[PDB]
C-alpha cells in the first residue's frame, strides 16, 4: 500500500538492505523541497552525514516514525 | 564505500522483495541520481509514486536479475 517511508520505524531503517539507506535518508531530508538554488541536501551530503546522523537517531530511539525525523535533521 | 549504501548494485528482485515503503525513496534515485536539479529537470516526488514505482515493478517482474543502477533510462523513458 505505502510506497513512502513516513510509518517506517527506526528500527526498520536500521534493519534494511544497506543499499536503501541513502535513498531513505534523502527522502527523509528532501521530501519536501523543491530542489531550486541548491536548497537541498545533495546525494553525497546524505550519504555522508544524513546516513550516519539517522542511524546515530535511530538508535536512540528505534520506535520513532521517519515521517518524523525530517526536523530532528 | 558510499556505493554499498545506494541501489547502483541492487538487483529488481531485491526491489521487488523490499518493504514497500523504500519504494518511492529507491526509485527517485533510479530516476534522479545524476540529474540537473537547479533548472527544475527531474522527476518530481508525486510522479515517482504514482509512475515510477509502477514502471519499476514492471520492468523488474521481466528480469529480476537487472541491477537497478543499469535501469534510470528506461524509467525515465
Not at 534493519?15 to 541513502?22: E, V
Not at 527523509?28 to 546522523?53: L, Q
Request: aromatic letters at 8%; one cysteine or more; glycine letters at 4%.
Amino acid at each position: 500500500e505505502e510506497t513512502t517511508p513516513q510509518n517506517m520505524t527506526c528500527q526498520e531503517f536500521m534493519d534494511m538492505n544497506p543499499k536503501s539507506m541513502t535513498p531513505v535518508a534523502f527522502w527523509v531530508v528532501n521530501r519536501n523541497t523543491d530542489f531550486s538554488g541548491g536548497d537541498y541536501v545533495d546525494w553525497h551530503e546524505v550519504e555522508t552525514v544524513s546516513v550516519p546522523k539517522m542511524l546515530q537517531e535511530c538508535h536512540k530511539n528505534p520506535a520513532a516514525k521517519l515521517g518524523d525525523l525530517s526536523a530532528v535533521i
